[PDB]
Design a protein around this nucleic acid. Structure first.
Lengths: 164, 97, 155
RNA sequence: AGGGUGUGGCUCGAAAGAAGUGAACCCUUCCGAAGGAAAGGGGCGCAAGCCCUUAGUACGAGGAAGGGCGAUCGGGGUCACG
RNA sequence: AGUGCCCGCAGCCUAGUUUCUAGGCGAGGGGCAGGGUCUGUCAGGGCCUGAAGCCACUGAUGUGAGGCUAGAAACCGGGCG
RNA sequence: AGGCAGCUCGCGGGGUAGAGUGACAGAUCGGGGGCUCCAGGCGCCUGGGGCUUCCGGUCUAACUCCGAACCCACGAGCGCCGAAGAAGGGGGGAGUGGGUCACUCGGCGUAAGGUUGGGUGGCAAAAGGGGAACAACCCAGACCUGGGUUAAGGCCCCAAAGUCCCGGCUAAGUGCCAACGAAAAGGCGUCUCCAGCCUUAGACAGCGGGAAGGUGGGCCCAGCAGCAGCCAUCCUCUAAGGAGUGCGUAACAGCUCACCCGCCGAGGCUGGAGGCCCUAAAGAUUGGUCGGGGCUCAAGCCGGGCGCCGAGACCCAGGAGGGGGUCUACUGAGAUCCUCUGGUAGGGGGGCGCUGUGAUGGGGUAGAAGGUGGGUCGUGAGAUCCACUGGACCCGUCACA
RNA sequence: UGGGGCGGCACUCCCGCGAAAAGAUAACACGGGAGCCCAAAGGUCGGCUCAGGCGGUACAGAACGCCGCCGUAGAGCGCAAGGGCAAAAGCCGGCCUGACGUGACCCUUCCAAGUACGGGGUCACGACGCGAAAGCGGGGCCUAGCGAACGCUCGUGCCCCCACACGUGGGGGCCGGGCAUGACAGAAAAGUUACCCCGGGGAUAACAGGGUCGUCGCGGGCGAGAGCUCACAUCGACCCCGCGGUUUGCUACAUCGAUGUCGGCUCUUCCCACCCUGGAGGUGCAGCUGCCUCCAAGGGUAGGGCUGCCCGCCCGUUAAAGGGGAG
RNA sequence: UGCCCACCCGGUCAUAGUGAGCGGGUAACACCCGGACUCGUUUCGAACCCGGAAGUUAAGCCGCUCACGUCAGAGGGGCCGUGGGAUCCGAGAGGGCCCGCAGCCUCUCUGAGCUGGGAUGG
């Protein structure tokens, strides 16, 4: 299903697991990469621009692409560390019934059209919220710029970078 | 989905009490003072006391002491353009102003 | 903050929200191009704030007040047994300030107490004299300081 | 396409409507609602204009008087164009 | 069973009418009453009781009769093929 | 004789927006310390498992230690209506129970001129002006005629008024579109603005030279003689140079890279954001546009500004009608004052016509009736009249059916 | 009832959420419950304080018991949820039956603004029970656990039974209780009609417009990977952002006193996301054959077999035998 | 005198709490003495109940100090809303702006028991 289907907000959040049975397992499993507690100098972060919800599926892909670019750069345990901030707390639900029941004269249409859990999203509620960030030294900010930027290529929403 | 018209329906925090005043009835000082006709009172339901609990529909309002029956009082309150009488024990009444 | 305040309505009486439609009615502003004077107070302040997006109000001056009053006509008078008489002289006062007023038998001495609805005239040269939309805050609807005096002088 | 509408053109107009005890048409004088000028003068603004004056004046919707002219107007039908 | 308290309109009277809720009288009316009745063992509770309807015309609406007008497949009786 | 659709003050109620999670309930990411068990390796170390503590972060319609704006109750005050037109009580008669859309805060659902909620507004039943036409968008509530001023909008021509002004930007007809019509990315294409770094102790660019050597050190390597696979590294040195960048080469060699000098005397360079514009950007319904015409130091856009046109809204003048507060009449007619003026379902007030009955100062008829055409009255409903035709019966008034 | 049927009960009552800090407030919205159970799980009085954790003691054990310390509820309170609760509503004992008779007012049901039940609250009269007492007790800590007329039956003290009275029996009435209707504000109730019929319905299904785009086709961004080295000659995984209204999903705004429904035949036209033909280029282009990009809609784009089609498979040529629209 | 100092009877219901340290008692308050009678311990005079009362400030009580908990004040930092209006910007989501209001968290510093009714003690 296309990413344009869940970009905006359709109703409130969706969080209580005990109230919402059967959540598909999110793609993301690891959230921290690199030698945390390692010595770093440049302190660049990532900032979003407009509101919305981001599917975990893209994020996990964004997680992988960032790692390989850095991994080939120097190493995976070297003087760098990647940490993604948000978590897919939000859950999306879709009326899939038009697929199976939508061809057998069952209760089709908007009949009983409550959504069904198929994916999760990391919710964004503040203008300019952190999504991920990376810590390096003085000598590798240039590689870190596009490293975030290439990840941002896959994000659904417009993003912003900074240097610190 | 129509909601049940339970006598305490939709009260998840209406009858919630701030933790600082839990337990049995503390404010004995309010009760001991006695009302007479023509007095003006404010209804503030105590969720703890199960006796003479007025319905939620008239909570936090202005009441008038019109008489006394038994240990309890009866109170006149205007809600719409009608009149109503609420017979209640005093332990949800606080003087106005 | 001075006691003598006034208001002019410029909007019509259709598409007027339930909140406000009766307020101007309660403010005796039945329809646009009308005015009257009030003693300023917090109690009055509420209406003007709530009716700001429909009228213009501010503090009068002597020049405006004298000009404003001079307009009472055959059907625009004091509550002198209704009739909205044309004041036109102390004469109408002389025989009829002895009801609610005391000591105001001079046309000049109306600077204290009360009045009735008055039917205004369109502002000369266009209410859009320099404006085009009647709905800018700080320029169009509501409070305009002394400038209301020149605005009514155009009237 | 149609009708009402303004200006006209051409047509019927015996009575039934006005009208020679004055129609229609010209002037002249007067009153005047709200509203509302301009030339000139002076000043200001790069300019676009405004400000006081000229002035609520000339003007004006409406209404009054006189005169001169002298018999059709009102009305019906069609058509031109707005 | 059909009375007894009070507020109080119009009108009236009073002097001022200063111009008049200044006060009385106060029909009507309103509120507390009371009474008759059944029921409740008392409070109570239900109902009735403060002296005016009938008749006639027209009118309107409801109800029942075809029921503003028109509109069906239907079913039944008796005959005729 | 008070009433309350608003506001203010005073005095109360609240768990929503938000915020927090070591304040519960859960969700959820990591590190540090200590304790414990296992596996491996040489009592130790490593990895894994469980426990604790500390530190950090990520969410909650069904979490709330807190918590607004806000909305509501009551009293007082303000304000308005009120004995011309009246809080409460009773009574006759209804239609109305399929709404829709716009805006705004929701839910469902991606979505929908979808559905389903809260509040407001039309529309329905609301004309008149603009938006090109238009139920709903804005202005604004049509007793009538006339005059004037104005609104929303617009002002080159169609079509009323600005080829109106200042400053700046756009080259695509981008555009000339409120309700409606293009995303991410790319653009130093252009137009303005923040950083940072070198610049007259000569900046960038540009033009020639020195641009180097023990040494092409080199390790394994025929040779890699920087640049075959790992990598160090000193002075001959100084206004200059690396044990050295990309081309390269089997291996070279060589051209360059890095640095100074010679001229050079104005800025130059790198991250940043924005406006407009280009690509992205492709559908025919049959045929080309902003309404067209047409427009390019604009008839576009942005910042602003200045002046006008524009309706039935408002002012005025004249007439009309309703409602409400004085006079005459064997029962309707006058004067004066105030005021009110869109319109279906519905209620109510009053008026003309048709045919008959009773009457009826009454009357009318061989010159009626009716028809045709045309005057005049009346808002109208209609009335009433004149020429002719017709050839024998017909109206006015009141009441009644 | 987002046509109807199938589906399910959103049809009876209750908890929270929905629901936007007054009230009320929709969904075939979400997460859930009830058609009971308790003579004690009830009333009162009295006594003790829980879950859990720490230290020491034979069996002894993390957890049977015992002695100390901490433990603000993290336990427990019958049943779902919410709330409430610590000398208690919790736990343990004593005595009891008020889970009382009769007659009331009031809240919710059922806002403002009408109303059956049911539940609940506050009473008086009378007698009880508990405790010394104040006092507390007409059920369960509070919020779900339920049924009109008519008829039948039960208890109650009388009342009435005839056009004459009286006697006996037998009947009838009250007032309250039970016997039920879950479609739960209460008819006694199985299927087909494609032989159907009738009045209607665009308030509404099917084909056919409009909206939309899950799907479909296409485009673009980015670039793990393959290509000998080299991401971008060509392929591009994971993702992201856009277009078209060609099918296909929903929408019911229009059409039910008819817009006559698939295909095909003939015939006209359009569009470009170009199949070929023209122009230009790149290429892992010796040349041919290739592969790919861009511009370009002027023209052309067949003939057969199987299948009714569409689709699909295939035959032999051709430049290929492009794809879509126009109800 | 006195008034506060504790006490009994309280109201406020944590700014009043908890924990530790120290100080105060010949009265008051407890600790503490003993149980035959009252009553009473599903053992016990533990506790309760009764009779008491030597000692004693160690408990408690009380005051003070320090910590934490906790109310406020200020400072720093965190975070950020909402009514009212427009043919305003933006396709939308969203945002600015004029008219009215704010509060939220977290660190630093500074305070942190008040009070009615009666018999002892100063």
């Amino acid at each position: 299903r296309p990413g344009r289907c869940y970009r905006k907000f359709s109703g409130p959040a969706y969080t209580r697991r005990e109230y919402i049975p059967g959540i598909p397992m999110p793609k993301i499993t690891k959230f921290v990469m690199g030698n945390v507690n390692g010595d770093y100098d440049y302190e660049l972060r990532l900032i979003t621009t407009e509101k919305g919800q981001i599917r975990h599926n893209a994020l996990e892909a964004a997680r992988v692409i960032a790692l390989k670019y850095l991994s080939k750069k120097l190493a995976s345990e070297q003087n760098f560390a990647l940490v993604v901030t948000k978590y897919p707390h939000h859950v999306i639900r879709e009326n899939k019934m038009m697929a199976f029941a939508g061809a057998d004269r069952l209760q089709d249409g908007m009949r009983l059209s409550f959504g069904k859990p198929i994916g999760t999203a990391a919710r964004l509620e503040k203008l300019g919220e952190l999504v991920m960030y990376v810590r390096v030294k003085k000598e590798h900010l240039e590689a870190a710029k596009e490293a975030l930027k290439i990840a941002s290529s896959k994000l659904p929403i417009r993003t912003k970078i900074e240097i610190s | 989905v129509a909601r049940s018209k339970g006598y305490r329906s939709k009260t998840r925090k209406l009858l919630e009490k701030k933790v600082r005043e839990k337990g049995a009835i503390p404010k004995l000082s309010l009760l001991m003072h006695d009302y007479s006709q023509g007095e003006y009172v404010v209804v503030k339901i105590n969720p703890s006391i199960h006796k003479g609990m007025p319905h939620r529909r008239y909570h936090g309002k202005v009441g008038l002491v019109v008489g006394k029956r038994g240990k309890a009082y009866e109170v006149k309150v205007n809600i719409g353009d009608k009149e109503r009488v609420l017979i209640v024990r005093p332990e949800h009444l606080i003087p106005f102003n | 903050m001075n006691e003598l305040i006034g208001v002019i309505r410029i909007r019509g009486w259709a598409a007027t929200p339930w909140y406000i439609q009766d307020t101007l009615s309660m403010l005796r502003l039945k329809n646009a191009f009308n005015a009257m004077i009030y003693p300023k107070d917090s109690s009055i302040q509420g209406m003007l704030n709530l009716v700001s997006s429909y009228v213009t109000w501010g503090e009068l001056n002597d020049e405006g007040l004298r000009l404003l009053v001079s307009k009472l006509e055959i059907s625009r008078g004091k509550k002198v047994n209704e009739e909205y008489v044309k004041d036109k002289l102390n004469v109408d006062f002389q025989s009829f300030v002895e009801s609610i007023k005391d000591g105001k038998l001079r046309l000049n001495k109306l600077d204290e107490i009360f009045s009735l609805p008055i039917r205004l005239h369109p502002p000369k040269g266009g209410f859009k004299g320099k404006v085009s939309r009647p709905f800018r805050a700080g320029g169009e609807f509501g409070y305009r300081g002394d400038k209301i005096n020149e605005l009514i002088r155009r009237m």
